[PDB]
Amino acid sequence: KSLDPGLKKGYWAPEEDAKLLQAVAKYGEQDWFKIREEVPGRSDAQCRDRYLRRLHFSLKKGRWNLKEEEQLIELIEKYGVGHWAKIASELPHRSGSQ
DNA sequence: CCGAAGCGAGCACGGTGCTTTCCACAAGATATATAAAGCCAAGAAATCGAAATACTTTCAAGTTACGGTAAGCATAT
Numbered sequence A: 001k002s003l004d005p006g007l008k009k010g011y012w013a014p015e016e017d018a019k020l021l022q023a024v025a026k027y028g029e030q031d032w033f034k035i036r037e038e039v040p041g042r043s044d045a046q047c048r049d050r051y052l053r054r055l056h057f058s059l060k061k062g063r064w065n066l067k068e069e070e071q072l073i074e075l076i077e078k079y080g081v082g083h084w085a086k087i088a089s090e091l092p093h094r095s096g097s098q
Numbered sequence B: 001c002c003g004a005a006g007c008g009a010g011c012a013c014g015g016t017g018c019t020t021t022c023c024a025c026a027a028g029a030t031a032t033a034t035a036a037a038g039c040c041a042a043g044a045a046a047t048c049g050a051a052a053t054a055c056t057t058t059c060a061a062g063t064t065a066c067g068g069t070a071a072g073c074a075t076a077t
Helices: A022-026 A044-055 A068-075
Strands: none
Touching: none
């Protein structure tokens, strides 16, 4: 993903809405190397996490209400700290980076 | 019948320090036969060493799911 003349380091999504989302109907969540052969300027390593953090549905999002602190408590009560410990390996999509 | 000229010639040259073709017939050669004994000697049958075309495992190579901080931009005070 470095020293490559064919990659693009942009911030927005120019044509990504069509180049990257078609794979949702084309390929599964495996063998991402088939995607980079058709989408120029994008590498599979960043594309995986982009697809993940963009097309996920089950996330703790919204405004901080009077019922979310209990959610945080029961989240940090499942196995422990969760952010950086090994217990993050079994947390479903609850990665530490978020 | 002697005379001249070749001409062949015995005579000398110092002291020492054998092969094969036949009658001779008198022996030889090739002939069994036990019979114990070990070995040499060539033809099959059993056995084992070298190894190649294959199977396990080791080992290099890149692409894989999963972060570690760090920087540019939106919006509340």
